[PDB]
Amino acid sequence: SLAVYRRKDGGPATKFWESPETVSQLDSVRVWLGKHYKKYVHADAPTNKTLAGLVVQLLQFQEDAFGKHVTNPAFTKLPAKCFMDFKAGGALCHILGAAYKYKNEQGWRRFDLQNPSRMDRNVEMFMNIEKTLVQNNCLTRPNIYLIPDIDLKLANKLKDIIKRHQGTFTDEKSKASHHIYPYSEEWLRPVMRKEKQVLVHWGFYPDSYDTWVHSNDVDAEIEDPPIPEKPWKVHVKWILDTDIFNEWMNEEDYEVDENRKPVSFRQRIST
């Protein structure tokens, strides 16, 4: 099976971030930072490759501090998709901007993420990054409605998980981002192409486990992702698996219709 390639942890795909093409994609991020976070990046005047290296350090830090292997993590992982938004003014801009702003406000001389002596204030930096993403409408954490058929004990467990992962829950279905239904294999979905490589998403793994594999190992085309339609209809394992990975899972893997039947908007490819 192709799962021999599957990432064993949700740390950064270092080869992607060191690619010359990825470094060149950060040019517009660098330029945008020099205007909209000018007070906080002028000192360091970071290059495209320095920014790529900082992304790797930030991604490695949150996997080390908040990944699946951690018991009692102090924070929930930021969505991997946030780091892949290279548009001027997008999520990566605000992640890097917030990081440099926080460093400046704390008087740090350098970022020190690989250093175990420096985790409690690095955790606070990630809480600040998440606040900045929410405030700039790059990130919305789930506001969840539980369908009435979910029984009391299971609902109680789900509410605990939701709250511990920066989510909220509501009794007003029309205001919810997600509707959760009762739950009634080994597959992947290709999601991005770059030269002769394809990024694949593994079913029931979070996006930080997405893995770059050879294009000729996936005989399927990348289908367009679903257009966001409020609300997502997913079954309870979307929340239960979020607690395993300390990372909100991908709704597409858990989607159902209003009669709880599984929905696969994009085709699932057996591994």
Residue numbers in the entry: 27 to 210, 216 to 302
Text from the published report:
The BAF155/SMARCC1 subunit is a component of all complexes identified to date, incorporated either as a homodimer or as a heterodimer with its paralog BAF170/SMARCC2. Here we show that the N-terminus of the BAF155/SMARCC1 subunit contains a putative DNA-binding MarR-like domain, a chromodomain and a BRCT domain that are interconnected to each other to form a distinct module.
Residues 27–383 of BAF155 were expressed and purified, and their structure determined using X-ray crystallography. Residues 4–160 form a four-helix-bundle that resembles the MarR-like helix-turn-helix domain10 based on structure homology analysis using VAST:11 43 aligned residues, RMSD for CA atoms of 1.9, score 5.1, P-value = 0.0005 for the highest scoring protein. Residues 169–287 consist of a BRCT domain with a chromodomain (residues 219–246) inserted between the second and third strands of the canonical fold. The individual domains are linked via a network of hydrogen bonds to form a single structural unit in which a highly conserved stretch of amino acids in the α3-α4 loop and α4 of the BRCT domain plays a central role. Analysis of the sequence of human chromodomains shows that the BAF155 domain clusters with so-called “chromobarrel domains”. This sub family of chromodomains have an additional N-terminal strand that precedes the chromodomain fold: the BAF155 chromodomain does have a chromobarrel fold, but in this case the residues located at the C-terminus of the module form the additional strand. The N-terminal residues interact with a region of the chromodomain that in others forms an aromatic cage that binds to methylated lysines. The architecture of the fold produces a cleft containing two deep pockets at the interface between the domains. Analysis of the sequence conservation using ConSurf17 reveals two highly conserved regions on the surface of the module: the first on the MarR-like domain and the second within this cleft.
